[PDB]
Ligand binder design. Sequence first.
Ligand SMILES: *[C@@H]1O[C@H](CO[C@@H]2O[C@@H](C)[C@@H](O)[C@@H](O)[C@@H]2O)[C@@H](O[C@@H]2O[C@H](CO)[C@@H](O[C@@H]3O[C@H](CO)[C@@H](O)[C@H](O[C@H]4O[C@H](CO)[C@@H](O)[C@H](O)[C@@H]4O)[C@@H]3O)[C@H](O)[C@H]2NC(C)=O)[C@H](O[C@@H]2O[C@@H](C)[C@@H](O)[C@@H](O)[C@@H]2O)[C@H]1NC(C)=O
Ligand SMILES: *[C@@H]1O[C@H](CO[C@@H]2O[C@@H](C)[C@@H](O)[C@@H](O)[C@@H]2O)[C@@H](O[C@@H]2O[C@H](CO)[C@@H](O)[C@H](O)[C@H]2NC(C)=O)[C@H](O)[C@H]1NC(C)=O
Ligand SMILES: *[C@@H]1O[C@H](CO)[C@@H](O[C@@H]2O[C@H](CO)[C@@H](O)[C@H](O)[C@H]2NC(C)=O)[C@H](O)[C@H]1NC(C)=O
Ligand SMILES: *[C@@H]1O[C@H](CO)[C@@H](O[C@@H]2O[C@H](CO)[C@@H](O)[C@H](O)[C@H]2NC(C)=O)[C@H](O)[C@H]1NC(C)=O
Ligand SMILES: *[C@@H]1O[C@H](CO)[C@@H](O)[C@H](O)[C@H]1NC(C)=O
Ligand SMILES: C[As](C)(=O)[O-]
Ligand SMILES: C[As](C)(=O)[O-]
Ligand SMILES: C[As](C)(=O)[O-]
Ligand SMILES: [Ca+2]
Ligand SMILES: [Ca+2]
Ligand SMILES: [Ca+2]
Ligand SMILES: [Ca+2]
Ligand SMILES: [Ca+2]
Ligand SMILES: [Ca+2]
Ligand SMILES: [Ca+2]
Ligand SMILES: [Ca+2]
Ligand SMILES: [Ca+2]
Ligand SMILES: [Ca+2]
Ligand SMILES: [Ca+2]
Ligand SMILES: [Ca+2]
Ligand SMILES: [Ca+2]
Ligand SMILES: [Ca+2]
Ligand SMILES: [Ca+2]
Ligand SMILES: [Ca+2]
Ligand SMILES: [Ca+2]
Ligand SMILES: [Ca+2]
Ligand SMILES: [Ca+2]
Lengths: 424, 317
Amino acid sequence: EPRQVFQVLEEQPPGTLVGTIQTRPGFTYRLSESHALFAINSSTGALYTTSTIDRESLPSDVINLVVLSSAPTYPTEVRVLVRDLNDNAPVFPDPSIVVTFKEDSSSGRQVILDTATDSDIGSNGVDHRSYRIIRGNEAGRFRLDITLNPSGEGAFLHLVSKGGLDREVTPQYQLLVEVEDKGEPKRRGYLQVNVTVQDINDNPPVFGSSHYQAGVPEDAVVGSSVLQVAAADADEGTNADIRYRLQDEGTPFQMDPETGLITVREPLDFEARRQYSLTVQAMDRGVPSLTGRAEALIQLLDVNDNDPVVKFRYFPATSRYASVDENAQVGTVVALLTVTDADSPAANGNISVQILGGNEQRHFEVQSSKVPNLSLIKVASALDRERIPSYNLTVSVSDNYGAPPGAAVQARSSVASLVIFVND
Amino acid sequence: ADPQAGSLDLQIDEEQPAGTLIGDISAGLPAGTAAPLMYFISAQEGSGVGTDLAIDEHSGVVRTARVLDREQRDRYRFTAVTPDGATVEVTVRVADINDHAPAFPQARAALQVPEHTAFGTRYPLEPARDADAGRLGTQGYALSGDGAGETFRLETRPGPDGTPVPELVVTGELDRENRSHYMLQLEAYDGGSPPRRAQALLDVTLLDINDHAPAFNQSRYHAVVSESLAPGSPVLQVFASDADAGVNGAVTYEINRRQSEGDGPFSIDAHTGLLQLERPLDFEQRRVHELVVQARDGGAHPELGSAFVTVHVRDAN
Ligand SMILES: *[C@@H]1O[C@H](CO[C@@H]2O[C@@H](C)[C@@H](O)[C@@H](O)[C@@H]2O)[C@@H](O[C@@H]2O[C@H](CO)[C@@H](O[C@@H]3O[C@H](CO)[C@@H](O)[C@H](O[C@H]4O[C@H](CO)[C@@H](O)[C@H](O)[C@@H]4O)[C@@H]3O)[C@H](O)[C@H]2NC(C)=O)[C@H](O[C@@H]2O[C@@H](C)[C@@H](O)[C@@H](O)[C@@H]2O)[C@H]1NC(C)=O
Ligand SMILES: *[C@@H]1O[C@H](CO[C@@H]2O[C@@H](C)[C@@H](O)[C@@H](O)[C@@H]2O)[C@@H](O[C@@H]2O[C@H](CO)[C@@H](O)[C@H](O)[C@H]2NC(C)=O)[C@H](O)[C@H]1NC(C)=O
Ligand SMILES: *[C@@H]1O[C@H](CO)[C@@H](O[C@@H]2O[C@H](CO)[C@@H](O)[C@H](O)[C@H]2NC(C)=O)[C@H](O)[C@H]1NC(C)=O
Ligand SMILES: *[C@@H]1O[C@H](CO)[C@@H](O[C@@H]2O[C@H](CO)[C@@H](O)[C@H](O)[C@H]2NC(C)=O)[C@H](O)[C@H]1NC(C)=O
Ligand SMILES: *[C@@H]1O[C@H](CO)[C@@H](O)[C@H](O)[C@H]1NC(C)=O
Ligand SMILES: C[As](C)(=O)[O-]
Ligand SMILES: C[As](C)(=O)[O-]
Ligand SMILES: C[As](C)(=O)[O-]
Ligand SMILES: [Ca+2]
Ligand SMILES: [Ca+2]
Ligand SMILES: [Ca+2]
Ligand SMILES: [Ca+2]
Ligand SMILES: [Ca+2]
Ligand SMILES: [Ca+2]
Ligand SMILES: [Ca+2]
Ligand SMILES: [Ca+2]
Ligand SMILES: [Ca+2]
Ligand SMILES: [Ca+2]
Ligand SMILES: [Ca+2]
Ligand SMILES: [Ca+2]
Ligand SMILES: [Ca+2]
Ligand SMILES: [Ca+2]
Ligand SMILES: [Ca+2]
Ligand SMILES: [Ca+2]
Ligand SMILES: [Ca+2]
Ligand SMILES: [Ca+2]
Ligand SMILES: [Ca+2]
């Protein structure tokens, strides 16, 4: 019939006094069963612990025993309450976690964190109102938001951005979060929160120079390198991967999209086009892609790649032979000698015409006029068809005439013949 | 000052009939010269003198052998030589007429510009071609229409030859969730006595960026069910929306499996937001389930929204 109630603190030395049952004169007392935790003094009815009890280790902190008497037996039901100490701290599921905000997230964007638990009874358990940022928030970019579940079961913690995150200034934060329990000596737990700031494509590529400049000889072979451009992009990953391109796609140059090297793809020709002022673009691989631009001035350098040519001009122009009457006075123009060389005066040097046989009798002469590249072929002496009816004059023309040995420019040359019949 | 070597500068308008008069070589001789019997003509190969000009080698009169195009060739030079060896160096300059109006490659151009593009971003526009020279070529531009002036301005900076090339410059804020289409008109003109002109329509459309996150229509949802509720049956439907377009605004749903409490028996339809029961409940093991449901869009780096869901489970009897 009778029932008594004792309490004992956990974590106490073996042999701690639990309680003493209310005895009756002339009885002794034993436990009805052997108990792992307790033992009874049979003459006093005092109950003692046999080991150090861990309340967190028990299936139940209420234990039910039955004390039995000697003599004519009666039973005594005992209830032992194992009382809790605040000997566990609040703990997080992981000592450290990682969370991510996008740079240029709006003020008030949040991301969820972990909450703590505590293995003591609820009155020594986590105070879910106490979560606090204690280190790492020097810049004042963050605050905590706590949500206590209205049903009384548990809580949720969130980290809230106050806006103004810029990955290119601060890509990483490390916050320390402290939570308290509610126990006699207050205990604390801690969570390290690593904050990654995720990159957006907010920076465009930028060329190292806004004006490039290259010089290229017109005989540069295909595949040869012309000018290397390079841009930088202050973002990360794909957002800063740059592809280069020329704006005008109809030139004889070529831009490798990944290296920014401009090479020659089609043969150049100074005589056709001396210089190309081109716009180069650099484009990142972000979505919203962004673009930078620069200017590139490629001047071609003239090469001596054209022979000088001599043409004769004379009065049956539809014929391949000139004619001169035997009666023509000394000084009569018989033909013009015009030189054409498509290169520029730099690559050409001096151009000179020289007579290569045919005029052994000195009946004609070749005379430079006062106009560049035109000579006159005149009658120099009396003629008569009976002695000589025809002549064949051969002239050679040459650019870079009189150049010293070891000069950088090789001279080019051609020959031309003019035959002259005498009429009467 | 040397009678033996003179020069003559002649001029002729392009696009005149073949046979048109240009000038007379004898005008370049010293005054009082006996008219020569004939002239020798020297021109360099490639000069076009033989094909485009008709020179009377007896009289010295120069005409056009054909209709001359300044845009093709603007200058001829040759030397005339008398039979006794005096020279006249003559140049003919072909005068430019305004036989070309400015011309855009398209009457309707379409430009895509991302919403919220940074102030001062420049978009080069196709020029109006005009083959004529100097003031006769394209001189300027004018932009009209909605946003012209406040949201977009037109600017020209000379490229090669000083040919002005136009660029459209972002000067105001662009928001695709306010106004996503701009109809602009671009005008061009050369510098004739009455300028010749071209018009082109420019359709600017804003590309959507992922600047909204999904938002639930309640911050917390509640459902109340019997612990006898059969698996496979619905429990509750949540709803989030996203103001962007396309993938950026395409919302899907999941349950957060780390921070939820009482997580296992439930799943949610990734596209409809319907939470359903997957395994039987048990009032005596858990009376209340606290879940967090999440919405993500389809953006390149998805943006996220979440809401609380409290499920109250009632005992059978
Ligand atoms: C006026 O003189 C010209 C200059 O000749 C030089 O000077 C004379 C005085 C003399 O010293 C010659 O020995 C000099 O070369 C003459 O023009 C030259 O003619 C020669 C002969 O044909 C030309 O040579 C050939 O050129 C051809 C075209 O370029 C080549 O195909 C050829 O090479 C191959 O082919 C032949 C046949 O298949 C073979 O015999 C060769 O061995 C080789 O396999 C020759 O190289 C030379 O190019 C000419 N030089 C100039 C500056 O033009 C000219 O002769 C007239 O024209 C030539 C083309 C022939 O039709 C002659 O019969 C013709 O007379 C002189 N004019 C006269 C004499 O009226
Ligand atoms: C949270 O961050 C810490 C510290 O990260 C360091 O600093 C960063 C700015 C970056 O430069 C990292 O590379 C650095 O390691 C992490 O602590 C490190 O963890 C690794 C592996 O766990 C360990 O080898 C190192 O010794 C730790 N460094 C220090 C200083 O303790 C921690 O792991 C991060 N948490 C998570 C969940 O990733
Ligand atoms: C049960 O408790 C009694 C009382 O303490 C123990 O009996 C004796 O008690 C006196 C003082 O009351 C001590 O001076 C003696 O030393 C105790 N005897 C012994 C043998 O220790 C009794 O021993 C206890 N029973 C057990 C099993 O320990
Ligand atoms: C959130 O959205 C749902 C779905 O639209 C709403 O549920 C509706 O609620 C109205 C009354 O508010 C009822 O008339 C409808 O029958 C409900 N279902 C549907 C499919 O519309 C819910 O009310 C919304 N929550 C809030 C706070 O407005
Ligand atoms: C949308 O843009 C117009 C101007 O085009 C502006 O007047 C209006 O305030 C904007 N709407 C909102 C909701 O901001
Ligand atoms: C008259 As202009 C366009 O060549 O400066
Ligand atoms: C896992 As099922 C078929 O109950 O939705
Ligand atoms: C449910 As909420 C508005 O705290 O993300
Ligand atoms: Ca303990
Ligand atoms: Ca304890
Ligand atoms: Ca505790
Ligand atoms: Ca986490
Ligand atoms: Ca930034
Ligand atoms: Ca960035
Ligand atoms: Ca970038
Ligand atoms: Ca970087
Ligand atoms: Ca060349
Ligand atoms: Ca050359
Ligand atoms: Ca040459
Ligand atoms: Ca002279
Ligand atoms: Ca024309
Ligand atoms: Ca024009
Ligand atoms: Ca013209
Ligand atoms: Ca927007
Ligand atoms: Ca958007
Ligand atoms: Ca979105
Ligand atoms: Ca039940």
